[PDB]
Amino acid sequence: YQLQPLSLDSVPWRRQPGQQVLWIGCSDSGCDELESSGLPADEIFAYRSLGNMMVDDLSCKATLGYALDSLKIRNIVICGHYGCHIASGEVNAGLQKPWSSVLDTLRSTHRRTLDSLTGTERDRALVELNVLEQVHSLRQSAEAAEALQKQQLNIWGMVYDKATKRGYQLIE
Amino acid sequence: YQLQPLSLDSVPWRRQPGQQVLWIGCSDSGCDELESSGLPADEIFAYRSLGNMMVDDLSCKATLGYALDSLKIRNIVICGHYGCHIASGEVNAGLQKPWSSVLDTLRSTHRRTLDSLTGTERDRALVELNVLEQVHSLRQSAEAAEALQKQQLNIWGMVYDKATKRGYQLIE
Numbered sequence: 484y485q486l487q488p489l490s491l492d493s494v495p496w497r498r499q500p501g502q503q504v505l506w507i508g509c510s511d512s513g514c515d516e517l518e519s520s521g522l523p524a525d526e527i528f529a530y531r532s533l534g535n536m537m538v539d540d541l542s543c544k545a546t547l548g549y550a551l552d553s554l555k556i557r558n559i560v561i562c563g564h565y566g567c568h569i570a571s572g573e574v575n576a577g578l579q580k581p582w583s584s585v586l587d588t589l590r591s592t593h594r595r596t597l598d599s600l601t602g603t604e605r606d607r608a609l610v611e612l613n614v615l616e617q618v619h620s621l622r623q624s625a626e627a628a629e630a631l632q633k634q635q636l637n638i639w640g641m642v643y644d645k646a647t648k649r650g651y652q653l654i655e
Numbered sequence: 656y657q658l659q660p661l662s663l664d665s666v667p668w669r670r671q672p673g674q675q676v677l678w679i680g681c682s683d684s685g686c687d688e689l690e691s692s693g694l695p696a697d698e699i700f701a702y703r704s705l706g707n708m709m710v711d712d713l714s715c716k717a718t719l720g721y722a723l724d725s726l727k728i729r730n731i732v733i734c735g736h737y738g739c740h741i742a743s744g745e746v747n748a749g750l751q752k753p754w755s756s757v758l759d760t761l762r763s764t765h766r767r768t769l770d771s772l773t774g775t776e777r778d779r780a781l782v783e784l785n786v787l788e789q790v791h792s793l794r795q796s797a798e799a800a801e802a803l804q805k806q807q808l809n810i811w812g813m814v815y816d817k818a819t820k821r822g823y824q825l826i827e
């Protein structure tokens with residue numbers, strides 16, 4: 484995959500004004516990330532969760548369903564953020580399954596990549612890898628797969644950098 | 656309950672700086688509400704969900720658990736917002752259980768209060784009643800109940816008014 488800086492006036496999830504976007508962000512990020520969204524507040528329907536993840540739970544299924552069925556949303560953005568405390572390091576005792584399982588799988592699946600980086604760069608790669616895995620897994624849901632096959636849904640990944648105050652799209 | 660305007664310089668969930676607060680807000684609200692929180696961004700750990708509800712699922716349990724166990728959070732705020740589409744009299748077909756069941760139960764449990772009220776007033780009451788019920792329910796979570804018994808947790812309710820850019824605490 485590659486990282487492309489967003490231009491706020493041409494974002495892939497706002498090819499036209501006045502539509503709502505489901506924005507999946509992290510609980511230890513904050514409102515600064517939406518300043519990099521290219522979206523006005525009235526176009527943001529935000530689900531803010533542990534590690535900007537969607538897992539196999541009632542909350543994630545009902546939120547996606549409301550967005551697709553009630554709001555007729557055609558764009559989802561999964562926004563990770565550098566410096567995340569959840570998508571970081573090797574372990575966190577207070578983080579339950581399946582959130583902890585998803586991170587453990589990224590750490591094992593990408594052990595070669597992660598081992599070639601040190602500390603801070605390693606956490607940054609985990610944030611990017613989590614965004615890519617969340618986007619891929621959300622496309623593989625029965626409800627998203629049907630919508631994608633009709634060309635009525637796009638799912639996008641980006642990472643917000645609080646140091647540059649910029650978002651970066653994951654192209655891959 | 657009664658409604659009390661917030662004083663930004665003396666909020667119940669910030670009797671001291673530099674602690675994190677778990678902020679439970681609604682997906683169809685937005686970042687404007689945190690301008691009325693009395694909290695700087697660095698002190699906000701935000702779960703943003705359908706109807707600012709916590710339902711009995713893995714996401715509620717894990718989010719609360721992480722906040723109590725990993726972040727050692729001593730304050731929770733449930734923030735409703737006037738104009739909410741979810742906590743309203745409009746019953747949308749695409750809202751799943753148990754969110755739809757919580758609202759059904761509010762409408763029946765508070766039928767006396769609600770039945771004397773026209774649309775706009777009824778919807779503002781339903782926003783306030785949802786916040787109160789969410790605060791009451793969350794104190795009966797086993798993890799919250801243990802912390803309250805040690806005087807190591809407070810759960811607070813408020814409602815944000817986008818029109819006036821003001822918050823109101825629910826005083827029980």
Ligand SMILES: [Zn+2]
Pocket residue numbers: 509510511512534535564566567568569570
């Ligand atoms: Zn995070």
Ligand SMILES: [Zn+2]
Pocket residue numbers: 681682683684706707736738739740741742
């Ligand atoms: Zn709402």
